Structure formats: structure tokens, C-alpha cells
């Protein structure tokens, strides 16, 4: 059980076919739904392009095709942290258990619905003392 060398085109299941299918430069990286995935002939008189995985063309700098990494690719810690003390906010990452943001914080309307519901409702303070 050793590694073979290139003898067949990248449409058979001979070893090291996965990477060749992943390479978008090859024409074979992009297949048809009706090739395979076909219950019967009369179901569709059609062909449709489906593509094999979602992969960039260059092996290096592969993180391309993500709009987010392109935006923050020229942001510096000084630019990030030292904006202006009128409109700057904390960016540190805390322990998850401390930022739980419990139920009554999620929906504050429940809070004023409460209190009058249970607190300060139907108190009867009576004391049998001589002076009071």
C-alpha cells in the first residue's frame, strides 16, 4: 500500500485525486448534477453546474474571498484602541460566565411588569405594642 504516480486524469478514484479536483484552475473542477445524482432519465431533460467545494485559486494567501479579512487587513492596534474618548468602547474579551446578560436584562419590560406584580403588594403590617 504505497503512493502511486500520475497515470489517469482527475476523474477516476485513483489516489491523490481530491487535491486536483479542489484546484479551480483545472476544467474538471466543476461537475454536473445529472452526472450522478440521477434517479431516472425522464426526470430532467436538463444539465446544471454544481462546482466542487469552494476554494481559492492560489495555494498561498488562501484567506481571500472573505470580505471581512480584506477590511481589517490595514488596522493597527493604535488605530483600534486610541480612537477618541468621546466614542470609544472596550474591546477586551472577558470570561463568558461574567457577561451572561440574565433574563431580566434581556427584556427590561418584564421588570416593571414585575415589582407591582409581587413586590410592595398586599402588605399588612400590624403591631400590638403599647406606644408604636
Amino acid at each position: 500500500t504505497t503512493e502511486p504516480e500520475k497515470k489517469f486524469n482527475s476523474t477516476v478514484l485513483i489516489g491523490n485525486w481530491y487535491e486536483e479536483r479542489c484546484d479551480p484552475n483545472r476544467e474538471q473542477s466543476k461537475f454536473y448534477n445529472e452526472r450522478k445524482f440521477a434517479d431516472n432519465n425522464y426526470q430532467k431533460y436538463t444539465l446544471s453546474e454544481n462546482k466542487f467545494q469552494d476554494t481559492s485559486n492560489s495555494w498561498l494567501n488562501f484567506q481571500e474571498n472573505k470580505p471581512e479579512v480584506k477590511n481589517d487587513q490595514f488596522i493597527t492596534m493604535n488605530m483600534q484602541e486610541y480612537k477618541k474618548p468621546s466614542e470609544q468602547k472596550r474591546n477586551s474579551e472577558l470570561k463568558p460566565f461574567i457577561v451572561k446578560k440574565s433574563h431580566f436584562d434581556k427584556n427590561p419590560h418584564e421588570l416593571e411588569e414585575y415589582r407591582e406584580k409581587w413586590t410592595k403588594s398586599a402588605h399588612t403590617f400590624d403591631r400590638m405594642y403599647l406606644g408604636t
Binding site: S102, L111, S121, H123, M128
Partner: protein, 430 residues
């Protein structure tokens, strides 16, 4: 002064505690954000007992929450009243006891307690004059019964003169959720009788019957059962936070209820409890409260109080009432039922009166009674234990974590010794 601290462990203890703080905050007018919104001065008069004072004027409970998995402690913080507790008082592990008493007391629980004993020590040191401790836990679970009983032993060693309360939920055969309940329940009783000053036992079996019949509601859940226990728990310390004609703190209850040191297992109950549709047909008077108080079906224990003799009983009345009514009713019940009261101790009922009734009630009563009928619960639990242990079933878990079968036999002898010693006074005569 004379303030107390709260410790809860396990899932069952945490759910009981999470509702008890809800009840107390309502009485003193504390919203879930910790801001006072009451109307009377007496609400803020004795808030030092259960609450601390922080900068900015917010009140925080002095409670310690312990467990070995974050499953239940994540839910209690994400629900209502999750912002009441101090975030640093949450202490928990990462593995879980796995319903194994040996794991929760020898291997994993013993490792964690270094941290939790520090916060408990810090809390009990900063107080002005400590009065005692109180514990809420279940005897049918791993972390609840395992770490819970170990924590009692070490705190007792550091505070020999303080008093301890335990609100324990023992497992009954009719409602069983674990197969190794008899093992760890028996082991928890061994250490509990040695250290805890006062032990109150609760049954999920009895709580269902009360909610089924007395309240006549068809679909109870664990939310409602936790509320029934919560009402009784606040009732015991009611006279400690409000003025009254007769004052009796926790220590006074211990002296007047415990004749002999090893007999400190009580049963509790609450009154009045009436359904929604029948609440307008009742009249709130002392003569009718005492009827529901002594009702054998109203006790929170599966033990039938008429199957033994009351060594002693106590009643804590709340509201506006006359002492002549209270005193004359407790005499009549003793005379009418002299058979059910042991006869070498005269007038074995203690009565206390508090001037502030609970939320929305004209009157309420909390009953704490020490009766010989509690032996039946231990007998039926021990019967399950001896059938399982005679075949050494499920014993490879405990023997695989450092504890041997010598402790299992030793614990059973002490538990059987308690019942034989407890039943002796039922037939004892002067």
C-alpha cells in the same frame, strides 16, 4: 446582629435555594436588581440577617452556591434573580459527581473544597456576630449528599459553638429516580447525625399529596414543590427578622425540642393552604389553623404522626392574634390526644407569636414537630439497602475509589442503632 449564612449544593438544593431567595426578597421588598422598593420601615429594620451591604446601596444575599457541573448553575443565573447573587460566590467544578457518593466525598469533592471553604470562611468572618449556618441539599444525589455532608464536618470543626440547619430531601420508594439511592442516602445519614444540630426531612412523596389534594391542582411541577418548602423555611426565622409578643430564635428552638443529643430529626408543615375555588369559603381563625396544623396529611413527611408518640412539638404563629386563644388551643389538643403524646414530659408543646404575617395573608402558621413516627422512613430505606448490599450489587464503583466495604457495614450499624435507640422512648413509660 445574630445573622446567618446560606449554603446550597447539588441540583435539588439549588432549585430549593433559588426559590427561597425569591420568597425572602418579596417580604423585604427587594427587587431582583437589589433595590429596596418596600413601604414599611420594619422591612429594612433587620435586613442584616440575610443580606450584605455594598457600595452604592445595593443589597446582596450572603449565599454560597456549590456544585460539580455548570449545568444547573448556568440556568439559575440565566433566569430571574440571577443578578442578585455575587458572581464571585459561584464556585463549581468541571467533571461532575456522577451520582457517586465516594466520588463526591473522597476523590473529586475533596479536591474542590479548598476554594469554597475560603469564601465561606471569608463570609463568616466579616459578619458582626454569627448566629449559625443553614444547608439545603438532597440525600439521594452524588454531589448533594457527598460534598454536602463533608462541608458540614469541616465547618463544624472551625465553629464548634455555632448551630447548623439542614433541609434534607430524603428519597422515598414510591418516587424513585436513581437505582443507587439506598447506598448514598445511608452513607449521608451516618455523617449527618454526628455533626448537624438540626435536621429537617422532606419527601417528594408527601409534597405531591399536599399539592394534589389540599391545593387541588392537577399538574404540579418542581417549581411548585420548591415553593412549598420555601414557605416553611422562611417561617422558622420569621421571629428573628420581625418583632413579636414571644421571641424565639434558632437556639431557643433547639433547646426546647431536643431532649437527647442524638434525637434531632424533625418533620415540618405549613398552614393555611387552601385551593383557589375554596379560598372564599374559609374563615381565618386560630381554632381552624390549629386543626390543619396537626392534620396528619399536612406533614411534609411520608411518616404518619399517629403511628408513634410526639416527644415534643413547636408552632410558630404569624400575624395579629390573642395569646389566650393560642395558649388554650395548644392545651386542648394535648388533652384530647394524650395517647399520641409521651407522658413523662408535661406540656411538650412550645408556642411563639410574630407580629408580621407573610405576603398577602392575614395569618400563617409553621409547625415543627419531633415525633417517634420518623423511624419508619429509616426502616424502609435500610430495608432497600440490605437487599442490595447482600449481593454486593453496584459496589465496584465505591470500592474502586479508595473506600472499602468496612465503611458500608459500619454506616449501616450506626443507622440501625439510631432507629433502635429512637424507638426505645416510644414504648418507654414513667
Amino acid at each position: 446582629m445574630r445573622e446567618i449564612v446560606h449554603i446550597q449544593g447539588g441540583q435539588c438544593g439549588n432549585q430549593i435555594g433559588a426559590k427561597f431567595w425569591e420568597v425572602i426578597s418579596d417580604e423585604h421588598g427587594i427587587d431582583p436588581t437589589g433595590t429596596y422598593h418596600g413601604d414599611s420601615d420594619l422591612q429594612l429594620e433587620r435586613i442584616n440577617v440575610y443580606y450584605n451591604e455594598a457600595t452604592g446601596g445595593r443589597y446582596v444575599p450572603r449565599a454560597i452556591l456549590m456544585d460539580l457541573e455548570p449545568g444547573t448553575m448556568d440556568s439559575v443565573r440565566a433566569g430571574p434573580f440571577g443578578q442578585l447573587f455575587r458572581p464571585d460566590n459561584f464556585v463549581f467544578g468541571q467533571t461532575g459527581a456522577g451520582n457517586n457518593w465516594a466520588k463526591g466525598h473522597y476523590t473529586e469533592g475533596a479536591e474542590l473544597i479548598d476554594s469554597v471553604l475560603d469564601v465561606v470562611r471569608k463570609e463568616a468572618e466579616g459578619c458582626d456576630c454569627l448566629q449559625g449556618f443553614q444547608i439545603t441539599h438532597s440525600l439521594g444525589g452524588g454531589t448533594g449528599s457527598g460534598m454536602g455532608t463533608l462541608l458540614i464536618s469541616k465547618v463544624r470543626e472551625e465553629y464548634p459553638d455555632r448551630i447548623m440547619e439542614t433541609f434534607s430531601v430524603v428519597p422515598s420508594p414510591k418516587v424513585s429516580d436513581t437505582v443507587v439511592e439506598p447506598y448514598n442516602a445511608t452513607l449521608s445519614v451516618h455523617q449527618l447525625v454526628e455533626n448537624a444540630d438540626e435536621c429537617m426531612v422532606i419527601d417528594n412523596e408527601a409534597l405531591y399529596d399536599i399539592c394534589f389534594r389540599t391545593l387541588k391542582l392537577t399538574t404540579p411541577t418542581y417549581g411548585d414543590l420548591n415553593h412549598l418548602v420555601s414557605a416553611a423555611m422562611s417561617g422558622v426565622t420569621c421571629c428573628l427578622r420581625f418583632p413579636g409578643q414571644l421571641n424565639s430564635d434558632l437556639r431557643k428552638l433547639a433547646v426546647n425540642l431536643i431532649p437527647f443529643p442524638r434525637l434531632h430529626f424533625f418533620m415540618i408543615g405549613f398552614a393555611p393552604l387552601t385551593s383557589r375555588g375554596s379560598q372564599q369559603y374559609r374563615a381565618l381563625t386560630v381554632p381552624e389553623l390549629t386543626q390543619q396544623m396537626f392534620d396528619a396529611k399536612n406533614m411534609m413527611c411520608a411518616a404518619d404522626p399517629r403511628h408513634g408518640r410526639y416527644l415534643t412539638a413547636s408552632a410558630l404563629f404569624r400575624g395579629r392574634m390573642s395569646t389566650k386563644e393560642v395558649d388554650e388551643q395548644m392545651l386542648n389538643v394535648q388533652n384530647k390526644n394524650s395517647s399520641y403524646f409521651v407522658e413523662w414530659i408535661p406540656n411538650n408543646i412550645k408556642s411563639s407569636i410574630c407580629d408580621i404575617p407573610p405576603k398577602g395573608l392575614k395569618m400563617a402558621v409553621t409547625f415543627v414537630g419531633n415525633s417517634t413516627a420518623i423511624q419508619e422512613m429509616f426502616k424502609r430505606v435500610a430495608e432497600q439497602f440490605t437487599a442490595m448490599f447482600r449481593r454486593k450489587a453496584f459496589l465496584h464503583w465505591y470500592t474502586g475509589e479508595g473506600m472499602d466495604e468496612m465503611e458500608f457495614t459500619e454506616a449501616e450499624s450506626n443507622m440501625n442503632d439510631l432507629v433502635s435507640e429512637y424507638q426505645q422512648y416510644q414504648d418507654a413509660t414513667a
